[model samples]
Target: SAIKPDMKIKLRMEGNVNGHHFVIDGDGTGKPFEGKQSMDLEVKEGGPLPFAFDILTTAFNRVFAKYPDNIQDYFKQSFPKGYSWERSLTFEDGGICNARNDITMEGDTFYNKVRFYGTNFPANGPVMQKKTLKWEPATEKMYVRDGVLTGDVETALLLEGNAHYRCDFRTTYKAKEKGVKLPGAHFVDHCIEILSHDKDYNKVKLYEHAVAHSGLP
Candidate 1:
């Protein structure tokens, strides 16, 4: 009887990502998208936390724990072996975010929802509390923002949901190299959306301006 049904929560974050952080591109081509970029993420209720959360949290914790150098230590370079020792383009620029819940009131409404197992109270008098809680539909929207790539790419995550889960992102990066598998030019534009539902309903959509861009598999 103490369970709170219809609970809803929202978390939004804005940060940077680089070529080393090729988590997902939504095309399912099994290739890595490399660039210097910035993006944001919105996590709805029941959605899985971003894969980068744990990694970034640890770095921040180290900074506060008197080990600031660890900030450049945790994030490693998995691509471009030459940049492995260079930590200038990491998430060090960092991110900003906020979390919100649907319900904010927790006074008498809270007490009435949970009755004490051993406490005795007047059942039929002015002390009687009437419930004023009701379920409300959750509302959400997609987020889209792109950043100009400098020496590296920066990225953030966006996950939106109601009963299901989702991830949406729009990113812009400038390619530093020229090759057959790279973008047509130094400028790259990409967008991706992923919808997931308990392994039954899953979909992915991707778009890129460059034909032979690294975004392609």
Candidate 2:
């Protein structure tokens, strides 16, 4: 079934599942919004879903392609209220570095607040530096075709430094199944390809992929 482009469909889902409170909403303003509170299956398609190790193999490569390097550690089995992850990365060359991230979303916009602590930061002395990065469509419009949603955007990345890069993101989310032996299930397939340089340095050619069985509104 197809609907008219001028039609407005507002959707909102709020509930507490297993002590995890969530609010997922979409205002039909051309931006598709979905919520991910918890996820199952540590492996997908014979590949590791998240988490990182010293070895960088094919499985790790796949996970890295879909998620930010630091954010990988935050993808737990359940994040009741978004994700707040803090860890210290000890680099032989960079001393004991502390890092923190808070991630949440509203509409199609994802807010990521990051803080880095160290003794040697080139930007502003040795004081801890913090910044809030956003990932959203450059324009408030998204195209849907064949059940897939796509949009062009410039998202901020906190890789090795601070910089915003151009990217094209696509996602497809299915609603909860109805009238089944055991219902209430959803799946999401999402990816983002970076089309610009890395921190204004070398041109970045990266594609991050993610597929998950989760719930959404």
Candidate 3:
């Protein structure tokens, strides 16, 4: 059989399934929608797992051998230990280390959800993490109390007590650049080899603005 140069699949839909109510955002033009929006995914067909899937599963299983009843592992960046880096500004100063920690302890997985903010700090540069000040956001330009960008407030403060309330962020959440695009086809070529250091490797990332510092001095 000749493989069609381009397949035709006019699909566009969202919302829950089964016990639910929904509406398809169709057009009167009578043309079928070609694709889905951000979260749109369709498992068009189902069959046996591909060879790559099996290989990846084997690696995952090996990695999870230490933890019983676990099917997968998570790799994360940064943790209880902090890291400092350049805080690329939209129009000013370096970065401030912003961290928010959260924990999840329920019937299943028990761990923390920590959010680490900052890039790799340069060798010979100002320490952005060292300057921790307070922040109160309402109106007027916020300033880094460390006397750096003094009083250059703009309706909201810039340095909100250790990079907490970063109002002068260059990128907004609504922008396209703020989103993450996971690899699609690249999955097949990956996951075959899971590297580690003579021991089981697992990491968890925490949520932002959720940690309480009530212990130690």
Candidate 4:
């Protein structure tokens, strides 16, 4: 069976929390409407397993037994602590946020998601919080619009100075034949926008982000 090639591929990572939403701007064309996808993961308390090396080694050993040399090195460097990276970003809007992240590869594609917890900081440090996300390989896209919270459990724990939070993310892979064509090599294009809350919110903020290539070489 001959598979048709796609032109352009895109990747996106956007989401909202409390009353703040992060949107990626600049890419191509007009903004497009996007939707959300739901996922279910066995909820675990405490936090992600300790040590990134151990987790990555275990995951690879359990799945592939033997991984490519480059892949192992990438894991060692980019994901010293498994596939998670943490950093803080100060927004122009005068907001400071902290992020704890994780990325996983399912097949030919890779999935990465970060949980950004923001607070008034400097002023009162409005407690530590967290968010959840997932990436779709069929689309070469990632989404963070969905969040999970069990009642006041998270808020309460934060108020008590407890900074523990847990969220699960899943990744999948799709071939170029599964994607649509555009201006470049068969790839994935991700379109994302932030909808205003008011009825007169006709201004839908949009972004056209794309990844240049697709599939494992």
How do the residues 4-72 of candidate 3 rate in per-residue lDDT, one tens digit apiece?
212221222222211222222211111111111111112222212111111011101000111112211
lDDT of 2 at 45: 24
Query: Per-residue lDDT for 158-201 in model 4, tens only?
Result: 12244422212233222122222112122233322232212322
Give Cα-based local distance difference scores for all models. 0.20, 0.27, 0.20, 0.25
Candidate 4 or 3, higher TM-score:
4
- Cα lDDT for residue 160, candidate 1: 31
Q: Give the clash count for model 2.
A: 1
**Candidate 1 on 7-52: residue-level lDDT in tens?**
1112122233221112211111111122111222232222342222
Best by TM-score: 2
TM-scores for every predicted model: 0.19, 0.27, 0.19, 0.25
- Cα lDDT for residue 124, model 3? 33
The superposed Cα distance between candidate 2 and the true structure at residue 60, in angstroms, equals: 18
Arrange candidates, best TM-score first. Answer: 2, 4, 1, 3
User: Model 3: which ten-residue window has the lowest total lDDT?
Assistant: 54-63
The number of the candidate with the highest lDDT is 2
